[PDB]
Design a protein around this ligand. Structure first.
Ligand SMILES: CCCCCCCCCCCCC/C=C\[C@H](O)[C@H](N)CO
Ligand SMILES: CCCCCCCCCCCCC/C=C\[C@H](O)[C@H](N)CO
Ligand SMILES: *C(=O)CCCCCCCCCCCCC
Ligand SMILES: *C(=O)CCCCCCCCCCCCC
Lengths: 60, 268, 8, 283, 268, 283, 60, 8, 8
């Protein structure tokens, strides 16, 4: 049940890995993986009904 | 569009009501989510919902307010501002639970020689600050729900002091969005600006937002509409200019659960 | 073991 | 598929322009923010970008234990007017201000919770007596369960409530808790009441606090010293550190700009002028 | 353009400088030739040229002048008007030889209630007439090169008479384009008109023009920019209206030959 | 492909010579060092070489925890003129001399950092009272964050700053830190200023220290005793040990030959004669 | 995710190995491997534009 | 396991 | 694993 992932290596001394094993049945006990996803800001930065083209007039 | 069409000219139709505008600055869909009905996967109350459709999902116009050089701003809460609006308000008070989205259309025209800019903000869970410095979270239900007439911002916090018989009402200072945060940052909330040289209306499409799939509409307001003068009204040279602001709002994809006798709230 | 050790 | 630690976009080389495309001109009335990049308004060179947003992800922003309360208990002899002191704390993130401010950048949140307990003790009198090593009991009393009235009453049996028995001087205690909300997310803000004032019924009955939902959200922590009291008096403090793990957040808000004043959004007089003097044309 | 784009709205970017305009009347490329670098077939000095690129080929704004009911016109010479402009002027004085093209952007806005029309002319080898009737071709280098501030037209030829110690300067009569030819025909030169009801700017792209591939920039001006009021400024009813004119110019594809110590010209 | 622990080159057998090749003669003016080996100037036998340079690699040279500071805190009763003592230290490797000298064999470096903390306490008075086991809090305050003013003010909540809660008598505390420089390498030496004195602007404003870059490089460590004070006074010291791991270095320098005098290269009078008497023709 | 390497054996009692596993996600947490490379001193000992032959005259 | 255990 | 575990 071991889970192997790679570290994004900062200052160097192939890819380096680390190993994780979950000891508990409840997922709340698990540490945070930090393997997170990014999204694009559109829903906040451009919530407009008509798609905007930046080179064209915002208002036409 | 070579065949005519434009961003500034819109027609909105919901039910037996149509709005036209020739000077819009596009439309905003809050968080990019269009209103929708409750999905089975997210459903919670097991009874057959009431869905009023055209009878309630139409445009209701509230009382026109007036913008002047001394205006500090106005606010409203949803669904509260619509509580007495036709068959929407009735379906609202007959049921324990309800959910709704809204098309908010703010109207304010003037002239090529006027100037000024209104910030129109749709705030999720718009909790406002009270007038007391000796007790907190104490604004009364009656004071918190102005209904259609809404409330207003002040430029100055002035604490209710009659301790014996307290005002028990909000005291929302404009530069703090009435909630202890700076107005300059309210743009992280879904919004539009009515800048008199550019446009005469603001249109916001608001989804149902909450931490629950459906809730008590009588106990809880999902959205706050805040309108504040980002740049003050000014005209030609008149020291006392005035122009009207009209709010028209339409419930969207609204549904209700838990039917019983009508709720008769003490609102005074 | 093959399966178990999942790898990412 | 883009991960929090992927490198950001490269700058692309761009040259002179003389055209009808107008990136620089826009209209913020629309409610949108102009998505411009430097190559839109100046001549740029090409740059292979290495920086990433890894540390500003929502998890990474909150991945810190933060102090939410200090509980005081002691171990003295219970006597006719004053009793041995056990402590009771209503679980919340609003007794302190730092994590509260961070969570309130958002309207709603979802997370598992990690509670870490740091326990410190000392001698309160210019005595000379001693005390053998103390064991502390931290009992979780959920809303509805019998709250303890005495350091030693029947409730501390904990047949069903979760308790931690902590030995002094050992590594700080730690447990995890799932998302326990009766909603699909925690509400940092609730614009409403828990009661509908009904005309027909008297006002005093219809009433309730603005912005408060269930009177007792998550129950309380009750801490005691299990040891019988020594002749010498020892006071102990329990600091609770809270960390949101596996967190999700919705609907961003402007941060708190003026001092917190109570569990709500209320602000107190004389704390409302945060910004300082600085003239329009002064760098 | 159905997707928005227009003749009247332009964005120009050169180096770290961007110009926007929402009321242009297109752009002019003199003699239909875009600025370019010196070709090997036409090259003459054998040394490796200096090419400053973004450091010198950017927009420099000169001093804003003011248009009134009594203005008769203004003139400038290139490269002279840019002789003190940042790294362009420095590269200019360190080298014996140099060549450059230019984007000239003339700026003059007003209002829907003003009127007037400026003729903007780019003249190759704009030799102007002197103030003397007792000797010819005698305007001094200092008087001939005003630098950035430029010179002006007069409506009247008034001859310098102090024979003992002569003014030694130009005396450019407006209806004769300061050179003995009628202004009405200056339209055979690359030009644009800023007519206040139509546009607020003039944009001209000027190639390097000369009878040589490269020359002394300190000794010789390739282009003259002449701005004359074709139709006089007028507003509402004010007897003394005024509006600003700003000149912004960018060297284009400029290159220099013959490096040595800096030229320190006697300019007074 | 040659690794730090590979054996060094074998000596090869070499015999008599009578030729025009002149290994021994050279010209150091060129800036080069003559790459000679013994078989170039004497008759050598063959030797299979086993020795390696394993221990003098850059990692191996620095693979030691070195003391960079001693912090003093205590746990006494805060009283109107004197307060309970917490400590503040500006992170640096220059408060001590040994590791500083080793790092300064080089102009620039890159490394992850391992900090180990040794904590010792004792009784300051000829009392007899006691003290229960102490817990220490080591908070990292990065440049910009609120520096603590009191052993117990709000800053110790550490909602975002990293803190270590150390229990006395347990194994010394230890954490790791990445390469945190705002440059691509740390600069052991900076030949410049952080400010350009501008003619047009007054001199007092243009000024700044020679060789100093950001006034506050890496922020500070703030240490406190979490326990409320005992009647008896206990003083504690925190020794910090620093070890550069995963290190890289560039541009070698001659080692410091005279006593350090401040954070820069400055030397003090009377410390400038390191070498000792020894005559030219005395073995 | 275990990593197996060999020890350069000093005083003896086949090749002997040791085993390493990384427990942490951040590469800064990793111990030092000591598996380092050597380089040749040329850039410091012989930084001259023209390559030098030790048997020939340094200056010609 | 084969892959996972890397060996050097 | 096969290789990895050496056995004696
Ligand atoms: C033996 C130790 C057991 C400790 C058990 C703790 C369980 C209760 C968890 C508390 C949950 C609090 C979450 C924070 C607050 C809510 O977000 C806001 N009031 C909004 O709903
Ligand atoms: C809870 C403990 C956290 C400790 C966090 C320490 C982070 C800061 C690391 C300090 C980095 C110092 C590196 C040394 C100095 C620089 O090399 C020189 N001034 C040159 O740039
Ligand atoms: C998947 O986990 C198969 C491999 C198991 C490897 C050894 C695990 C180390 C000890 C784990 C015990 C779990 C404790 C609850
Ligand atoms: C690769 O690692 C697969 C084999 C795993 C072997 C057992 C690992 C021993 C326990 C490691 C737990 C990791 C702790 C973060």
């Amino acid at each position: 049940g071991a889970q192997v992932s790679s570290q994004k290596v900062g200052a160097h001394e192939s890819t380096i890995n680390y190993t994780t094993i979950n000891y508990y049945r409840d997922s709340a006990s698990n540490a945070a993986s930090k393997q997170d996803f990014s999204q694009d800001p559109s829903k906040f930065t451009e919530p407009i009904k008509d798609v905007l083209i930046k080179t064209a007039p915002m208002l036409n | 569009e070579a065949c005519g069409y434009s961003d500034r000219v819109l027609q909105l139709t919901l039910g037996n009501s149509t709005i036209t505008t020739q000077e819009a600055a596009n439309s905003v869909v809050a968080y990019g989510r269009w209103p929708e009905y409750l999905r089975d996967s997210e459903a919670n109350p097991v009874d057959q919902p009431t869905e009023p459709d055209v009878a309630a999902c139409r445009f209701y116009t509230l009382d026109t307010v007036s913008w002047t050089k001394e205006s500090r701003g106005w606010w409203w809460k949803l669904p509260d501002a619509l509580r007495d609006m036709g068959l929407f308000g009735q379906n609202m008070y007959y049921h324990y639970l309800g959910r709704s989205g809204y098309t908010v259309h703010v109207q304010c025209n003037a002239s090529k020689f006027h100037q000024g800019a209104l910030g129109v903000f749709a705030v999720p869970e718009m909790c406002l600050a009270g007038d007391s410095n000796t007790t907190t979270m104490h604004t009364s239900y009656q004071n918190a729900n102005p209904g259609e007439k809404g409330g207003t911002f002040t430029g100055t916090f002035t604490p209710d002091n009659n301790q014996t018989s307290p005002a028990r009402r909000f005291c929302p200072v404009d530069y703090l969005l009435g909630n202890g945060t700076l107005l300059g940052n309210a743009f992280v909330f879904p919004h539009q600006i009515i800048n008199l040289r550019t446009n005469n209306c603001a249109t916001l499409v608001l989804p149902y937002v909450n931490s629950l799939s459906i809730d008590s509409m009588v106990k809880h307001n999902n959205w706050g509409i805040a309108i504040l003068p980002l740049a003050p009204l000014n005209f030609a040279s008149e020291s006392s200019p005035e122009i009207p602001i009209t709010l028209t709002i339409a419930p969207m994809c609204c549904e209700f659960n838990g039917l019983r006798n009508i709720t008769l709230p003490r609102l005074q | 073991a093959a399966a178990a050790s999942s790898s990412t | 598929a883009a991960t929090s630690r992927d490198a950001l976009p490269n700058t692309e080389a761009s040259g002179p322009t003389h055209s009808k495309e107008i990136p620089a001109l826009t209209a913020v009335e629309t409610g949108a923010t102009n998505p411009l990049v430097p190559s839109d308004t100046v001549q740029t060179r090409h740059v292979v970008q290495h920086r990433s947003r890894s540390e500003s992800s929502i998890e990474s922003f909150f991945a810190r234990g933060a102090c939410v309360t200090i509980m005081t208990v002691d171990n003295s002899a219970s006597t006719t007017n004053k009793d041995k002191l056990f402590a009771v704390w209503k679980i919340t993130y609003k007794d302190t201000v730092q994590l509260r401010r961070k969570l309130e950048f958002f309207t709603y949140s979802r997370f598992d919770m990690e509670l870490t307990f740091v326990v410190t003790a000392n001698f309160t009198e210019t005595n000379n007596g001693h005390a053998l090593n103390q064991v502390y009991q931290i009992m979780y009393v959920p809303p509805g369960a019998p709250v303890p009235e005495k350091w030693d009453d029947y409730t501390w049996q904990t047949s069903s409530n979760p308790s931690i028995f902590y030995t002094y001087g050992t590594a700080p205690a730690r447990i995890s808790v799932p998302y326990v909300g009766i909603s699909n997310a925690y509400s940092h803000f609730y614009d409403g009441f828990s009661k509908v004032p009904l005309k027909d019924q008297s006002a005093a009955l219809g009433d309730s606090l603005y912005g408060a939902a269930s009177l007792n959200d998550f129950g309380i922590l009750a801490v005691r010293v299990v040891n019988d009291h020594n002749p010498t008096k020892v006071t102990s403090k329990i600091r609770v550190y809270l960390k949101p793990k596996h967190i999700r957040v919705w609907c961003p808000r402007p941060p708190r700009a003026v001092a917190y004043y109570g569990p709500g959004v209320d602000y107190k007089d004389g704390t409302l002028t945060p910004l300082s003097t600085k003239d329009l044309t002064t760098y």
